[PDB]
Amino acid sequence: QNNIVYFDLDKYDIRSDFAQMLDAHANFLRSNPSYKVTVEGHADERGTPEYNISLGERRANAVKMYLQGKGVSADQISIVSYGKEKPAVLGHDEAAYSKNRRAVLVYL
Amino acid sequence: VRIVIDSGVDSGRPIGVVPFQWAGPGAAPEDIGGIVAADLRNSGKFNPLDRARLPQQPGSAQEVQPAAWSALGIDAVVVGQVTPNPDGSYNVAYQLVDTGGAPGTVLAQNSYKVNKQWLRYAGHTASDEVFEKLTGIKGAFRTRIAYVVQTNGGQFPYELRVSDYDGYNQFVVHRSPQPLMSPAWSPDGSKLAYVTFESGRSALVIQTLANGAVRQVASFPRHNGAPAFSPDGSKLAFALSKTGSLNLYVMDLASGQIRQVTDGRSNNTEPTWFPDSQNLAFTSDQAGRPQVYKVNINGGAPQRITWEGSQNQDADVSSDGKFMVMVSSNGGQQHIAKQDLATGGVQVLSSTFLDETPSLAPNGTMVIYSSSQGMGSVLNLVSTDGRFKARLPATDGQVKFPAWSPYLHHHH
């Protein structure tokens, strides 16, 4: 919950409510130059699998650009879009879709 | 999986398919007549007479009584024989007999010598010959399908599988702890390209089915996916997003040389070949919402070709190049649609929920695709005229990413 950015339908911009959250990750990455974050981007099920990769990518790339704007080296950030392949929750309403439109920061 | 038909048979051409004669004691090793009847029904074009109702059960063309079948509005009858060979193989023979305007004439016949494990194949060959003789369309009954099954739980929840088009003779191509995407057939039917996330990121690979050999195609940073083999056997199209958005690339299979085909800031993916092995249809979001575009790999700007609804994507071009099927969206629903590539005319084919990844049978008469039923993905069939609808239910796991094989150039 301190490592997930959520997005509206066909939106990929970093909302203010996630700024503080991401700032903490940027602080950690700057202070620890050997660590790499992987940003895993996701889409909801509406659409098609290969195209929806791009919706996950735009979300994950937005996190990357935000972190780079906070001084993080490009080589400490990787992105991997899972498109609609790895839903957080099952379901066919906005409750599920909103939970699934996300970028997750993980230290693997 | 197995085929369950939901609608469309009643309107089909009535035909008589008689149980095949068996030269031995007890039951035949396989029900060849049953295979032929099922295949013809599965095509959406035929209505085989129920066994409760056969007016006679002739074991040869000479035993056919044409009048018994014209009385029922049946203008053709399939009869046949299965016989054992001393080497342990079988002969499977059929005769297609006219019971209409040329009563008693044999329209087609053949015999196949097969081992016990290839008896279904023999049945499908008979079906293919009957189907082509009567309809003028090449049969697809000897084809296979590829698909991904995702189980709940286990170390390897994702499996890429292959079966005959009707579900029989299923086997596992690859098991994975992470998602598998977008299997694509080589035109010789020997290989599948597919995407795996098992390494922690996407990799695009080609696997040879007979021995499991794997060739790595691409695992650049970001996405590597959406493969499609050219019909001429020379190239693989695919999408990579290493440049910052999805773009199309082509690999010369002989040399392994990769060439970039698109370089837009837009996303360009889901390529599908035209029959010439030079033109692709593909999805681009250049215009805003996804639409289907066409481009020649050798030069020129992509041209938008779709205007249906609000959004169109994920196309599959027919083997003759006359039409494509695709996923068309609005407002809040998405279905399989067919577009005539000469006129721009469109017909929506399906009414199921969250329709995706349509793949045409090699004779262009049938579409396999995936939809959502309850909480999970399932496989569906719809004819290209929209009249015939069926499903391929599985006993366990979600089923998705179907791909129909090309024609041919414990197993049973």
Beta-carbon count within 10 A of A6 CB = 15
CB B130 within 8 A of CB B138: no
**Does the beta carbon of B127 lie under 8 angstroms from any beta carbon of chain A?**
no
Per-residue HEC secondary structure of chain B comes to CCCEEEECCCCCEEEEECCCEECCCCCCCCCHHHHHHHHHHHCCCEEECCHHHCCCCCCCHHHCCHHHHHCCCCCEEEEEEEEECCCCCEEEEEEEEECCCCCCCEEEEEEEEECHHHHHHHHHHHHHHHHHHHHCCCCCCCCEEEEEEECCCCCCCEEEEEEECCCCCCEEEEEECCCEEEEEECCCCCEEEEEECCCCCCEEEEEECCCCCEEEEECCCCCEEEEEECCCCCEEEEEECCCCCCEEEEEECCCCCEEECCCCCCCEEEEEECCCCCEEEEEECCCCCCEEEEEECCCCCCEECCCCCCEEEEEEECCCCCEEEEEEECCCCEEEEEEECCCCCEEECCCCCCCEEEEECCCCCEEEEEEEECCEEEEEEEECCCCCEEECCCCCCEEEEEEECCCCCCCC
Q: How far is CA B344 from CA A90, B75, B308, B322, B337, in A?
A: 37, 37, 9, 11, 12
Beta-carbon count within 10 A of B241 CB = 24
Beta-carbon count within 10 A of A70 CB = 15
Chain-chain contact of A48 with B179 (C-beta, under 8 angstroms): no
Place of tokens 């993980």: A106
Q: Chain A partners of B268 at a C-beta cutoff of 8 Å?
A: none
Query: Which residues are paired to B263 by β-bridges?
Result: none
Three-class SS state of A40 = strand
Total length of chain B: 412
Q: Chain B partners of A54 at a C-beta cutoff of 8 Å?
A: 241, 245-246, 267, 269, 285
**Which pair of structure tokens corresponds to residue B175?**
């098991």
- Phi, psi of B222, rounded to the nearest 5 degrees: 65, -145
Q: Chain B partners of A92 at a C-beta cutoff of 8 Å?
A: 353-354, 372
What is the distance in angstroms between the Cα of B374 and the nearest Cα belonging to chain A? 9
Instruction: For each of the domains in chain B, give its residue range(s) and CATH number, in order of start.
Output: 1-142 (3.40.50.10070), 143-412 (2.120.10.30)
Question: What does DSSP say about strands B258-260 and B268-273: parallel, antiparallel, or unpaired?
Answer: unpaired
How many angstroms from the chain centroid is the CA of residue A24?
A: 15
- The coordinates were experimentally obtained by X-ray
Q: Distance (Å, rounded) from C-alpha B284 to C-alpha B293? A: 7
Of B223, B313, B327, the CB nearest to A53: B223
Chain-chain contact of B313 with A46 (C-beta, under 8 angstroms): no
- Phi, psi of B360, rounded to the nearest 5 degrees: -80, 135
PDB resolution in Å = 1.5
Q: How far is CA B81 from CA B58, B107, B123, in A?
A: 10, 17, 11
CB B285 within 8 A of CB B242: no
Instruction: For each of the domains in chain A, give its residue range(s) and CATH number, in order of start.
Output: 1-108 (3.30.1330.60)
For chain A, list the strands marked E by DSSP.
4-6, 37-41, 77-81, 102-106
**Which pair of structure tokens corresponds to residue B4?**
């369950």
CB B301 within 8 A of CB B287: no
Chain-chain contact of B223 with A49 (C-beta, under 8 angstroms): no
CB environment B303-319: b (16+ within 10 A), e (fewer) = eebbebbebbbbbbbbe
Place of tokens 């066919």: A92
- In eight-state DSSP terms, residue A75 is G
Q: How far is CA A4 from CA A17, A68, B215, in A?
A: 11, 17, 36
Three-class SS state of A38 = strand
How many angstroms from the chain centroid is the CA of residue B142?
A: 10
Among chain A residues, the shortest Cα distance to B291 is held by A51
